[PDB]
Each structure stands twice: as C-alpha cells, then as structure tokens.
Amino acid sequence: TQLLADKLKKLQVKDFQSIPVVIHENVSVYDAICTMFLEDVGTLFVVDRDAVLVGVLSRKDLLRASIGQQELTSVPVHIIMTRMPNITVCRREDYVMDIAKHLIEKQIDALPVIKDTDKGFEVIGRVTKTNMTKILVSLSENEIL
Amino acid sequence: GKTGTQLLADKLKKLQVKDFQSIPVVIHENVSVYDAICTMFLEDVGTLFVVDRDAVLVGVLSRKDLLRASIGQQELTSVPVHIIMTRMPNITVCRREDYVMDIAKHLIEKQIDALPVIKDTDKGFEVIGRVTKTNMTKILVSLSEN
Ligand SMILES: Nc1ncnc2c1ncn2[C@@H]1O[C@H](COP(=O)(O)OP(=O)(O)O)[C@@H](O)[C@H]1O
C-alpha cells in the first residue's frame, strides 16, 4: 500500500485552502477580537500597510490580552501578535500532508498560504485543521482524485 | 469497494472513537470564567466540558466563549461558568463505539472543534474522552506515514 500513501502525499494546498482573514498591524486588540467574531474564525493574519504578512493572532493571544487588562481599545495588535521570522507559512503548491504534520509538530490550528511577490509574502489563503478534517471526510467517502 | 481509494475509504469508515480519542479535560459548573480561562491555558485545550455535582455533563466552553465573556460590557469574568456555558440538551456528544467519520461530519456540519465522548449512566452523560479536529488531522498524517 506504499504507492497509495505516495499519491496522498501529493495532494496540494491549491485544492484544499480556505480564504485568508487579515487585519492591518495598526488595528487595536479590541478591533481584532471583533473581527474574530464577525468572521467567526480562530486565527487572523496580520499584515503591514503594503500588505505583506507580519504576524498572527489566535484566540489564545487575544484571551491572554483581555485578561492582562491593558487599555485594549488603544493597544495595537503588533504589540501582541506572534511575529515574523517566526510563523509557519505554506504555498499553493505545498502538499497537504506536509502541512498536516506542521500543524501537529507545531500544535497550531492554521497556516497562512502566502505568495512570493515583488512585494514580499502576501496572503492568499489559509489551511487549517478544518480543511484537514474535510479532506478526511472526502477520503472516507471516496471523493478524491 | 473495488479500488485502492475505496478500500482506504472502507477502513476510514470502520474506525471507532475509542481508538482515536484524547483525555477529557473537565471543570465543575461553579468555577468562574477566570478559572476556566486558566484551566484552559494550563491543560492547553480549546474545549472544556462542564459537569455538575454528580459529574454529569451540563455544558461546553470554547476559547471564543471565554473570549466573548472576558470582553462583555458586563463583568462576566467573575461569574460561574454555568451562566455562560453552551448548555444541554444542545450539546453534541458521542460514544466509544461510534464511527470516527460520523463524528467528522458533525465537527464540520455543526462548526465545532470538539465532541465530548460520554458514557450513559442512569443520571446522565459521564465524560470519558475528547474528540477534536486534532485527532482528525492525526489520522490523515497516519494515512501518509502508515
Ligand atoms: N501559523 C502559525 N505560525 C506560528 N505560530 C502560530 C501560527 N498560528 C498560531 N500561532 C501561535 O501559536 C499559538 C497557537 O495558537 P493556535 O494553535 O492557533 O490556537 P489558540 O492559541 O486559539 O489555542 C498562538 O500563540 C498563536 O499566536
């Protein structure tokens, strides 16, 4: 059954990514939490003015913040975001299997799908445990490839 | 089925929760929102299950449930979690003998991350395990290594 595993290891992000949810880095912690409920997501991708990736913000970053009791309404998200270097990203041609393992090796719920531009790492989707769970329902229902 | 991907599908459909579950992380219903937020970081989970004086399921709590609460206009941080829990009977649960992929549809269709695994007792559901999207993602990985 090794060529079957081979073939799964070649499913690509292109086909299984969700949209990106992004915020500007100069947005407040309060505003980012708001966006989190409006978009009903679990991770936000933080961008700079033009509009390259610069960090990420999970439910736990924000909860940590709101329990910290700084002036939330004034406090910009670059203060608390997880920053570049230093985020696990992927690209549309990356294999979902690899991505699944990163999500496990690194215990995070989502990766950003970036694109190498003449601006930098721009954000063009996400891939998350939900995507993985969907790919896993699709296979059990024999609906892939 | 006739094909490789069909046989793969066939085994996927036969996997039961009992073999793909994580420990339950469980709090009492008279604990504060603040304590819940702490337990949540301590145990490093995204869903706490809430039980009563008899150890019987009474609700769930997600990370966003507690985020919403901790920034409510009203002070909700000091209040008991039963004020703010998603209550029974509108919690979706599962049992050891349930098929994993039946549970994967529920996670997706109902748009939740975890289902408590429970045991029927004459007094209600006893929490005996956790099933989440992390469990699900591990099964995918295993497909590629195994
Ligand atoms: N793609 C990522 N790359 C690097 N770090 C991340 C990434 N996504 C989240 N993180 C950080 O790692 C932690 C894990 O958060 P995550 O697993 O998404 O959910 P949560 O914090 O809601 O339980 C958070 O501190 C988050 O900011």
Ligand SMILES: Nc1ncnc2c1ncn2[C@@H]1O[C@H](COP(=O)(O)OP(=O)(O)O)[C@@H](O)[C@H]1O
């Ligand atoms: N197993 C469940 N059954 C019923 N409701 C749940 C269950 N798990 C979570 N919920 C509720 O559904 C909403 C979404 O939960 P979930 O996706 O798990 O976390 P979050 O709110 O961080 O996105 C929350 O209000 C939570 O109380």
